[PDB]
Amino acid sequence: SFVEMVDNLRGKSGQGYYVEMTVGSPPQTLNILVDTGSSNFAVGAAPHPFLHRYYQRQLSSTYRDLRKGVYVPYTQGKWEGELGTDLVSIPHGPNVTVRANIAAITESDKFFINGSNWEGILGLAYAEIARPDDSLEPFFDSLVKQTHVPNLFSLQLCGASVGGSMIIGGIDHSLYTGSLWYTPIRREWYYEVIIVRVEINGQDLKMDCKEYNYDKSIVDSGTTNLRLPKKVFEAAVKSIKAASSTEKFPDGFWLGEQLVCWQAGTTPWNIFPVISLYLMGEVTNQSFRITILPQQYLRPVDDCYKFAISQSSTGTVMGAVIMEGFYVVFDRARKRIGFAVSACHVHDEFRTAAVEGPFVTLDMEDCGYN
Ligand SMILES: CCCCNC(=O)[C@H](C)C[C@H](O)[C@H](CC(C)C)NC(=O)[C@H](CCSC)NC(=O)CCC(C)C
């Protein structure tokens, strides 16, 4: 069953996680970034300095041109291309072939990453945010419509080259410990969720919970950092600075520009706090919390690290540094996202990443932004 999909993801730190796919007839093999923050399937289809290979439409007898252009902008990076369809398979996934929409990327700007080893992107979110419009059916919708694959997938992203698993069509219980805790998908466009409380080293940030979700909160395997709205980012950095005031850092460290180093094995993990995000639960007035260790938001790049929490003007993004400690179930069928402690979690000496509940939280619906 699912054992064939365990360990089907690879990556380089800070450069995304990718799965192997084939497109066209005869099959052309490509490494494809797994991106829950978007909804277009697109591949390099022309030479590029950072591409070692690309999709050659003229060599595929099953390619069909849709005679329509497309452009997709991301938080950082963008591409344009030509829409079409072709047959697609996932060698270390389910034994199926689907005809899917594919954008052939012909021009791009700050999209491909030098040395990342991937040549395309698999947008796993919903049609509502697909370009050029929501009539372009995303890959996973095509997969579910054309085969018997159930309407869900799960991601285990493993940190410190990196690896992981994308279980297509189900949940693999060997990939997590403890219980799964579920939060509602607020609206099917991004994987949007509602954060109802934030604590740092056990102290409530004491902000209006609308601030945590201004103007949305999303889960995105294609973003490295935890990205926070301006007011929340400032409160969080103020608290983290205070907890670590024992040591001194450049001010560009807190902006993500400069790295900090310590003698190998002497990193003072103890002076950096844990961060708890409380998420809306499945029953009335109930939440649960996920706890993040500094080993997740200090990304290794002697031992040197970059601060991987940064400021956003488009809402909270729960990126890889959040997802890396957990097994995350995208349960589209039941419109919910599950979190459990990952089997590939990092080890602090006295602290552990956790998923804990239940908690009582009043007036949770008021935390969503309108
Ligand atoms: C069209 C509507 C949907 C748009 N969705 C998005 O823009 C989502 C929120 C972001 C999307 O996941 C892209 C993916 C990237 C590979 C381009 N990520 C980024 O733009 C983020 C922006 C970071 S701002 C410090 N890129 C990274 O974190 C760098 C590492 C990645 C190459 C793995």
Side-chain angles (χ1 to χ4, degrees):
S1 7
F2 299 146
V3 68
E4 298 184 297
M5 297 180 270
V6 179
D7 296 333
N8 64 356
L9 305 184
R10 296 188 176 184
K12 301 193 178 176
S13 172
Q15 301 194 332
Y17 293 82
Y18 58 86
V19 67
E20 177 180 287
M21 303 183 78
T22 73
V23 300
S25 321
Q28 302 179 40
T29 300
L30 296 165
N31 290 329
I32 304 301
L33 178 101
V34 292
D35 192 54
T36 60
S38 69
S39 305
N40 283 81
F41 182 37
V43 301
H48 188 278
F50 299 162
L51 289 180
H52 289 130
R53 54 190 174 172
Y54 56 87
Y55 177 42
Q56 293 179 284
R57 288 160 285 174
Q58 67 279 17
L59 304 188
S60 171
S61 63
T62 38
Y63 165 79
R64 304 171 186 169
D65 195 343
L66 285 174
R67 301 186 58 79
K68 182 172 289 180
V70 59
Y71 161 80
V72 174
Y74 306 93
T75 299
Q76 293 181 333
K78 53 187 167 177
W79 54 258
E80 59 182 26
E82 243 296 308
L83 287 171
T85 73
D86 210 338
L87 301 185
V88 176
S89 295
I90 306 184
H92 308 284
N95 301 329
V96 289
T97 297
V98 300
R99 178 160 287 271
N101 291 314
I102 309 175
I105 297 173
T106 53
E107 199 178 309
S108 68
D109 185 16
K110 302 177 173 99
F111 179 68
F112 298 115
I113 303 296
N114 186 16
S116 72
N117 206 33
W118 51 262
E119 298 91 42
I121 181 163
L122 179 66
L124 289 163
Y126 297 94
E128 177 160 348
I129 63 173
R131 302 300 182 93
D133 56 73
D134 65 0
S135 69
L136 193 76
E137 185 175 78
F139 174 83
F140 202 84
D141 293 80
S142 297
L143 175 60
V144 171
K145 192 169 232 264
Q146 295 172 30
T147 74
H148 291 117
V149 174
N151 189 21
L152 82 165
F153 64 89
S154 50
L155 289 173
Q156 183 202 40
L157 306 186
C158 302
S161 293
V162 292
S165 306
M166 174 174 61
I167 308 303
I168 296 161
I171 296 168
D172 190 313
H173 297 255
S174 72
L175 301 186
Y176 69 95
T177 62
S179 306
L180 274 161
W181 287 86
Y182 286 91
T183 193
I185 294 171
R186 184 195 186 193
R187 173 183 157 204
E188 289 155 303
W189 58 328
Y190 297 93
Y191 290 104
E192 185 185 359
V193 302
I194 291 172
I195 297 167
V196 301
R197 182 183 309 167
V198 179
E199 289 177 342
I200 296 187
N201 264 1
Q203 189 116 165
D204 191 326
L205 272 197
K206 290 168 39 169
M207 307 187 57
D208 184 340
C209 62
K210 271 188 173 73
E211 302 289 353
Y212 304 144
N213 311 291
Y214 173 68
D215 57 357
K216 60 184 166 297
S217 294
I218 71 172
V219 182
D220 181 14
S221 58
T223 294
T224 295
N225 287 358
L226 171 63
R227 307 186 60 238
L228 297 170
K230 175 181 174 57
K231 290 179 172 183
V232 180
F233 174 77
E234 290 165 351
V237 171
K238 183 180 178 195
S239 178
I240 296 170
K241 274 179 175 166
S244 56
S245 56
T246 299
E247 309 222 347
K248 203 57 169 57
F249 312 83
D251 201 355
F253 169 75
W254 300 108
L255 296 177
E257 302 164 343
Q258 297 173 276
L259 55 161
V260 64
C261 309
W262 293 275
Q263 178 200 145
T266 62
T267 304
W269 295 113
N270 62 306
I271 65 172
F272 293 96
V274 301
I275 302 174
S276 298
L277 309 179
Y278 292 69
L279 301 174
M280 178 183 278
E282 288 295 345
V283 310
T284 292
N285 293 338
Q286 171 260 322
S287 61
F288 66 96
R289 74 186 187 198
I290 68 181
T291 303
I292 305 300
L293 299 181
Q295 289 88 341
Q296 284 164 262
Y297 63 79
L298 296 181
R299 180 169 60 87
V301 298
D302 285 356
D303 297 328
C304 302
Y305 306 89
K306 287 198 169 183
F307 190 56
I309 304 175
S310 57
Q311 185 180 333
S312 169
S313 67
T314 60
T316 296
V317 182
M318 290 169 63
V321 301
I322 299 300
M323 296 182 67
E324 282 172 1
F326 310 104
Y327 186 51
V328 185
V329 176
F330 295 78
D331 188 353
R332 297 155 56 98
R334 295 169 72 166
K335 303 188 188 180
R336 58 187 193 165
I337 297 176
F339 292 82
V341 173
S342 177
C344 68
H345 65 276
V346 63
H347 190 61
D348 185 92
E349 193 170 4
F350 69 115
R351 300 173 298 182
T352 178
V355 188
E356 296 172 309
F359 289 80
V360 58
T361 303
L362 304 177
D363 303 312
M364 276 178 330
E365 299 300 325
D366 296 334
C367 300
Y369 173 79
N370 299 304

